[PDB]
Design a protein around this nucleic acid. Sequence first.
RNA 1: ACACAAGG
RNA 2: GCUUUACA
Length: 523
Amino acid sequence: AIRTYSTQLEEILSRKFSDHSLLLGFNASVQAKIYTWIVNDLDQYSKHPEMEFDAIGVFDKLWTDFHYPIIKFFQQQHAVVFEEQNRELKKCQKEGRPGEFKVRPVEMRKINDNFMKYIKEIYQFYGKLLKYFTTKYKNPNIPDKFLEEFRFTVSGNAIECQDDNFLGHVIHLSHKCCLCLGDMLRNQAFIDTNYVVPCLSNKEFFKFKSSPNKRNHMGSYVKAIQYYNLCIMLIPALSEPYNQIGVIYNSVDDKFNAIYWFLRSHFSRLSEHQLGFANMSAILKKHWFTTALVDIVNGNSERRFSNANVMNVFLVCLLGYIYCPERYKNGPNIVKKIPFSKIETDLFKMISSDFDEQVVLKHLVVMFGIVRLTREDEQRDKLLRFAFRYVEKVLVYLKTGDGLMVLRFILNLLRENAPWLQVFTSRRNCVVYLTAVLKRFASDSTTRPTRMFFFEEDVNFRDCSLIKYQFKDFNDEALFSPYIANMVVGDYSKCDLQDAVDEYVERKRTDAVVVLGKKILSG
RNA sequence: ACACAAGG
RNA sequence: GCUUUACA
């Protein structure tokens, strides 16, 4: 069925002259047919053997062979007209009449208007499917925050307590819906920023040529990221949403956040392990970080990175010096006579002067991710020694600063990775600083504390293999029940804590860090 | 100058 | 051990 429609679609898109109405009507008919098919397939799930259940595979085929190829077709049409504008510019320039060059904003807009109609149709289609999946069946594994995000309300519908597997298929289908919405909006925003906006005026055109994108325009992707975040909320184990978030950051030249998300994609529990590493490496093999490093050290620059961005560039350059020496190692210097030790010193000062818990958390994820990916024992050991020097600087700061979330992460990283814990305890200094940090915290907790809900860091690192998919410093047994998920997404809106949430969280985090630190130090 | 990490 | 760079 899907193949037949795909073949008809390919015949339509290969026509030299696009009949937009034919394409839209064809899509609408295919959508209507797939909708009725999906609902019957879910309803008949009990009747036809559970391996015969195709809806997941048809959904992936619907996206890959039908909806996305139409997106790419429209994207190509935008590219053709954009290159026509380029051909005019080169012609006028060669002919000695560069001031006569005029953008032609007509016949860009008509093509984009047809694209926008298509996007609106499929946006409604996938939203309609998502509403069906999320409200037709009672699924206690769908967090309330997700329903609130869409303002779905489950009526007294069918209750498939009979089969957890059915509910798993339904939740996967909802994930795919959110993924398609994110992907469609991402492609739309990409087309708009790179083809449509540049073709609106000469006033639009030239800046794109001079500034490659200088894409501080992240707002245009906000909605796509939102949908991708919803995907991670539903099934954080799946690698694809993290990869697409990284793709967004990569497109806006935020190469560090791209790397972070590609590593998150690689380390998700059910990761395919293809996309994230390849994209991250494609960044690392390039010259962006080395060029940013030279611009930072030379001071005078339009580049003009913020302090946290400076730390990110320093971190990646220092890691590359060990992990990717062909690009980042020239004797004792990273590039252009810039010593490795100088940049390491500068970063370690910034940890004390510009300590940001989220910045440090991303630093830790990137750094220990690269450690995890390094096979060569010499490279891995050098990287680990660098990472633990960084951790030592953090612990020194934490002799006077706050940072309990970072400390929880560091301690669970050590707890869950026995080789790294062994290296940590083999370093005298690490032990001394950890002892001094913990001596500040009073705690009558001797056993792992219980808590009422997941804290921010717990939600953020769900199914991240770096900590073996969950924080284990808490006794969370009472939270891990099928018939509630609001506590696992950290939704405390139902908890009678008012303004006392922050002190409660701080106290509970302190208790957990005291217990786990003692356990680490005792060994 | 002595005590710390990088490099051959 | 020495030699070079960086920090303290």
